[PDB]
Amino acid sequence: PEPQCPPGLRQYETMAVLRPDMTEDERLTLTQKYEELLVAGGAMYVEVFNRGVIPLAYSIKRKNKAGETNNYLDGIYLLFTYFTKPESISPLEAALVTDDDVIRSSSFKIR
Amino acid sequence: NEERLLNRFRREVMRAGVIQECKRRRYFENKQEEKKRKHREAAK
Amino acid sequence: SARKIPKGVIHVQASFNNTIVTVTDVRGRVVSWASAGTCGFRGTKRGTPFAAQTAAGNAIRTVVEQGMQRAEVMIKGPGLGRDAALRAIRRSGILLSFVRDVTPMPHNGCRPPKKRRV
Amino acid sequence: KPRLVLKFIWMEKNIGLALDQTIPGHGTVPLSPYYFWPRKDAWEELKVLLENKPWISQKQMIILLNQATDIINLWQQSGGNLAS
Amino acid sequence: SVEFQVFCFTNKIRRLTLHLELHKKDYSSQRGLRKTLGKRQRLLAYLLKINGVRYKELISKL
Amino acid sequence: NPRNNLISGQRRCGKGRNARGIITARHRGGGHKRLYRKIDFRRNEKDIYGKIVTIEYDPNRNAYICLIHYGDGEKRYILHPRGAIIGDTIVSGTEVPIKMGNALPLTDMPLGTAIHNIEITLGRGGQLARAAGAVAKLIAKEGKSATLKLPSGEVRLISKNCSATVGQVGNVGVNQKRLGRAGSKRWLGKRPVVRGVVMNPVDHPHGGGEGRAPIGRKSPTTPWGYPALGRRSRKRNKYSDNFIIRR
Amino acid sequence: PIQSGDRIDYRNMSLISRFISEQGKILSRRVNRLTLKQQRLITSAIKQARILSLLPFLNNEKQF
RNA sequence: ACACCAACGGCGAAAGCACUCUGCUGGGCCGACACUGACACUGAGAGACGAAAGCUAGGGGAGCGAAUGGGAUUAGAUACCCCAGUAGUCCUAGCCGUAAACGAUGGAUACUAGGCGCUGUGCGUAUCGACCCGUGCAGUGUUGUAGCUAACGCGUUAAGUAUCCC
Numbered sequence: 073p074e075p076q077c078p079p080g081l082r083q084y085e086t087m088a089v090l091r092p093d094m095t096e097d098e099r100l101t102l103t104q105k106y107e108e109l110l111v112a113g114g115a116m117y118v119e120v121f122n123r124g125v126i127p128l129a130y131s132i133k134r135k136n137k138a139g140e141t142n143n144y145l146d147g148i149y150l151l152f153t154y155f156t157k158p159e160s161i162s163p164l165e166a167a168l169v170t171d172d173d174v175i176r177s178s179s180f181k182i183r
Numbered sequence: 184n185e186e187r188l189l190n191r192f193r194r195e196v197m198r199a200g201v202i203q204e205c206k207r208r209r210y211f212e213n214k215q216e217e218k219k220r221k222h223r224e225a226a227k
Numbered sequence: 228s229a230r231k232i233p234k235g236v237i238h239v240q241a242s243f244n245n246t247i248v249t250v251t252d253v254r255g256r257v258v259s260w261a262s263a264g265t266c267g268f269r270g271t272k273r274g275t276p277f278a279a280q281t282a283a284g285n286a287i288r289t290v291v292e293q294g295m296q297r298a299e300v301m302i303k304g305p306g307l308g309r310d311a312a313l314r315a316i317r318r319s320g321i322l323l324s325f326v327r328d329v330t331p332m333p334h335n336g337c338r339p340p341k342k343r344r345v
Numbered sequence: 346k347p348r349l350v351l352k353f354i355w356m357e358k359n360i361g362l363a364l365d366q367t368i369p370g371h372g373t374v375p376l377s378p379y380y381f382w383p384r385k386d387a388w389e390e391l392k393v394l395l396e397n398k399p400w401i402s403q404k405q406m407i408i409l410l411n412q413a414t415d416i417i418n419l420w421q422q423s424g425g426n427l428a429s
Numbered sequence: 430s431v432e433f434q435v436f437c438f439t440n441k442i443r444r445l446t447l448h449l450e451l452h453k454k455d456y457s458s459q460r461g462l463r464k465t466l467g468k469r470q471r472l473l474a475y476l477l478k479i480n481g482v483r484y485k486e487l488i489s490k491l
Numbered sequence: 492n493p494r495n496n497l498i499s500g501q502r503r504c505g506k507g508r509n510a511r512g513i514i515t516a517r518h519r520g521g522g523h524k525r526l527y528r529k530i531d532f533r534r535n536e537k538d539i540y541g542k543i544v545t546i547e548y549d550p551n552r553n554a555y556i557c558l559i560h561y562g563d564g565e566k567r568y569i570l571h572p573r574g575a576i577i578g579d580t581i582v583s584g585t586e587v588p589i590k591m592g593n594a595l596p597l598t599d600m601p602l603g604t605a606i607h608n609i610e611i612t613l614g615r616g617g618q619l620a621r622a623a624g625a626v627a628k629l630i631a632k633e634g635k636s637a638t639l640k641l642p643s644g645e646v647r648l649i650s651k652n653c654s655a656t657v658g659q660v661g662n663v664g665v666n667q668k669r670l671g672r673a674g675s676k677r678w679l680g681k682r683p684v685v686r687g688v689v690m691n692p693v694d695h696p697h698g699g700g701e702g703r704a705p706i707g708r709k710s711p712t713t714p715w716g717y718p719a720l721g722r723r724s725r726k727r728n729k730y731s732d733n734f735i736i737r738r
Numbered sequence: 739p740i741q742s743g744d745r746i747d748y749r750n751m752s753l754i755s756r757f758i759s760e761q762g763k764i765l766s767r768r769v770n771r772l773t774l775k776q777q778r779l780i781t782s783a784i785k786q787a788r789i790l791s792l793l794p795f796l797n798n799e800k801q802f
Numbered sequence: 803a804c805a806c807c808a809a810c811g812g813c814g815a816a817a818g819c820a821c822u823c824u825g826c827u828g829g830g831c832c833g834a835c836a837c838u839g840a841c842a843c844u845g846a847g848a849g850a851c852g853a854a855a856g857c858u859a860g861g862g863g864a865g866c867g868a869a870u871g872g873g874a875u876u877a878g879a880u881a882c883c884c885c886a887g888u889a890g891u892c893c894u895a896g897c898c899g900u901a902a903a904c905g906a907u908g909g910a911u912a913c914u915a916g917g918c919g920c921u922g923u924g925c926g927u928a929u930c931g932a933c934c935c936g937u938g939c940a941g942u943g944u945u946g947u948a949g950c951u952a953a954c955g956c957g958u959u960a961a962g963u964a965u966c967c968c
Binding site: 184186188190191194199201202203205206207208209210 | 243304305309310313314317320323326328330332333338339340341342343
Binding site: 430431432433434444445448449452455456457458459460461462463464471472474475476478479 | 814815826827828829836837838839840841842849850851852
């Protein structure tokens with residue numbers, strides 16, 4: 073079902089880990105910035121599914137906007153099996169670095 | 184306790200010989216082929 | 228005195244020419260340290276397994292005001308001072324939970340200096 | 346996947362640890378490797394051989410390593426004393 | 430098909446050149462641009478060796 | 492469009508140097524009239540956009556300035572940063588996103604950003620880091636202060652509610668614009684300075700005798716007697732707001 | 739063996755962690771007994787999962 | 803700067819290239835006839851790139867570290883050892899154009915035993931799916947027939963047999 077659209081442009085999958093605290097505006101507001109990606113990308117944007125929060129190995133260094141406070145052991149594991157033009161992925165990187173509830177966001181390009 | 188030593192025995196898994204390796208200088212393929220040829224043949 | 232808790236970590240800085248046997252609590256305030264230079268002899272003699280045995284013995288013989296049962300040892304580094312130190316702590320025989328290594332394993336950080344050519 | 350035997354021998358000076366290993370889903374012939382009288386490492390040599398196999402499951406490698414460890418341990422104590 | 434080779438190499442040099450001039454330091458693709466120029470140039474000396482008028486059309490097309 | 496009716500006209504005459512008439516800021520005089528440019532340091536119109544139409548050469552500065560309009564009917568000049576595309580839009584405000592050219596108070600922004608025009612307290616026009624390439628960075632913030640590394644290799648915790656125009660200020664290439672015409676120093680209204688060895692003992696403390704005189708005193712001094720090497724000229728108790736001099 | 743049809747990704751933490759040790763370091767091809775292609779692909783995937791802190795860079799030493 | 807991965811491994815024309823991810827982009831290999839029809843090889847002079855050290859300009863500077871300074875060994879020590887340590891090392895933009903820049907082997911085509919390997923793809927077997935066997939090629943390695951060689955050795959990636967070009 074996914075090989076329908078990739079005549080024309082590319083395919084990706086972004087892994088992004090989250091804060092473990094909030095349960096509200098986490099599925100919501102990060103899907104709203106996924107709608108910011110929808111203004112950017114506008115392709116078969118499906119399967120943005122969530123993975124359960126588990127203890128990771130080692131993480132420090134949240135870098136809140138002038139917080140620089142929280143160490144972590146847990147995080148919500150979002151991954152977006154999205155699909156876009158190869159133009160404007162670096163603004164997705166800046167969007168997934170600058171926002172607070174998204175730390176350590178590594179995108180990929182499955183083949 | 185008994186006088187058995189499994190820390191030395193377990194220590195050769197990842198030997199402290201990566202620290203007698205890293206005291207002296209970063210040198211290129213002549214002594215990395217000597218140490219890593221003798222080491223690629225010590226495990227075979 | 229101290230917090231008076233009989234569990235606490237022991238660190239053994241086994242150097243290439245020395246040993247240091249320090250002992251500290253869970254937070255990290257040292258309750259005693261004794262090295263090979265502490266226990267008398269100094270020079271080419273220090274950093275040998277007799278110095279590890281004597282330095283460990285004179286290190287943890289002074290924790291009898293605590294009388295620590297639950298011991299755990301966190302050694303570090305290369306040298307001839309490890310195995311005699313563990314035989315010293317097992318000679319004192321207190322409840323050694325687990326020994327471990329915390330040695331700095333670099334990921335090619337800094338250039339180590341010149342080879343000796345001696 | 347067949348299952349396994351370490352054989353130890355204690356004589357005062359010298360341990361031998363001998364690892365006899367077995368087949369995965371791929372038909373293989375191990376020996377028993379005997380690790381030797383000089384101070385050259387027995388556990389590292391044995392465990393490394395097992396890891397190099399992958400043909401050995403974790404349970405199998407570990408059970409043999411635990412038995413090996415136990416003998417090296419008894420050997421160290423007997424050598425430091427005279428048990429015999 | 431020859432004029433698809435010359436025209437295809439011409440679009441190759443267009444897209445690779447507008448890559449390279451806004452980039453300016455890739456010293457690996459410089460060989461690709463120069464192999465394309467030389468390969469196309471031996472094609473143009475080939476079709477000039479064969480014909481007049483037809484190679485005049487290849488010049489006048491681009 | 493020259494004669495903007497924002498060049499503001501009347502000044503104190505040229506590069507002056509007279510307090511009561513005595514030379515008190517030395518080596519000044521000469522050059523053009525150098526009519527100043529009243530620019531808009533403290534942006535008093537927040538949350539209204541404004542384009543950029545002209546990069547005019549201010550002779551008072553080391554950098555350039557730029558003429559900015561608004562959606563309403565006004566005209567101002569501001570320091571344009573590096574990367575001022577002609578026709579680009581700048582807008583001051585409290586929640587305006589970070590762009591090379593606009594202004595915002597020092598709270599609502601991240602840390603580790605290039606900013607030229609910052610304020611040292613509220614209400615002032617604009618003090619620090621406004622030269623031709625003077626760029627100030629942010630180390631992390633605090634309860635009512637903000638440690639700011641300004642372009643001297645010097646850090647300073649500052650009042651957090653201060654306006655700041657984010658961007659690296661342009662015209663950096665005056666680091667290398669050579670004055671090799673050798674009388675172009677006089678075009679800037681800067682007379683030649685005489686040297687202390689070749690003066691008389693009534694004028695400078697290093698007034699010498701025969702030949703190229705060595706400096707003679709235990710320390711090289713100013714023409715008013717104070718030692719001119721290493722002696723920090725700073726009052727011992729003013730603010731204690733700086734963290735480390737780092738110089 | 740254990741190729742299992744589906745390709746090795748960082749999301750597949752079953753065959754991954756059969757390949758690292760408990761000390762957390764990558765084992766070679768002659769130990770893991772794969773092809774060169776399997777080895778490089780689990781290498782890049784394991785280092786990706788190393789970025790996501792799914793896997794430790796160092797495991798603290800233990801006895802008893 | 804990037805441990806284990808690291809392999810007698812992959813890529814590049816060479817120098818070189820390894821923490822991961824993205825973008826642009828070179829080059830290689832394989833198949834079907836799908837197309838053109840010798841468009842081929844080499845290359846004087848020329849042009850590009852070209853480890854490291856070096857130099858101009860500006861940053862940056864933790865470790866290491868010429869020069870230097872002190873301590874030691876020494877008859878002596880400007881040296882090996884040790885403690886500090888500046889240029890340099892890194893980056894931006896250039897210049898320099900040399901190295902044991904080594905496979906001590908210019909390039910290209912055709913032909914001439916094998917064994918043991920590795921890498922990439924292709925076919926058939928086997929299952930119907932990962933294997934696994936043979937293979938078609940290209941590349942990389944190790945022993946080796948013939949032949950060559952003063953000998954050591956090289957040997958389908960020749961230092962063999964021939965042809966061309968510098």
